[PDB]
Amino acid sequence: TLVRPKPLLLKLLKSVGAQKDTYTMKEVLFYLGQYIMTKRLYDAAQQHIVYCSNDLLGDLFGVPSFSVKEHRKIYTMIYRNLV
């Protein structure tokens, strides 16, 4: 089943090329991954940590940083931004 992103998540996915209004979780994760790489939000010395405190992604997820190794927490954060 497709999901519908809330307006701010949708803005972020659109900034990396997404064109739809509805997505699979696989597509949201992909785009979110592209976004973090493009804006260089990961620590280049400690790659599993994403520092989003001064970025839109911080506003979206409500956290200053997060770990890519904490899979359950990433999905929780994404889910709050889906209808």
Binding site: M37, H48, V68, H71
Partner: peptide, 11 residues
């Protein structure tokens, strides 16, 4: 451990 590799392990 690279971001790209590690992110691909989410699903």
């Amino acid at each position: 451990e690279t971001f790209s590799d590690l992110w691909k392990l989410l699903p």
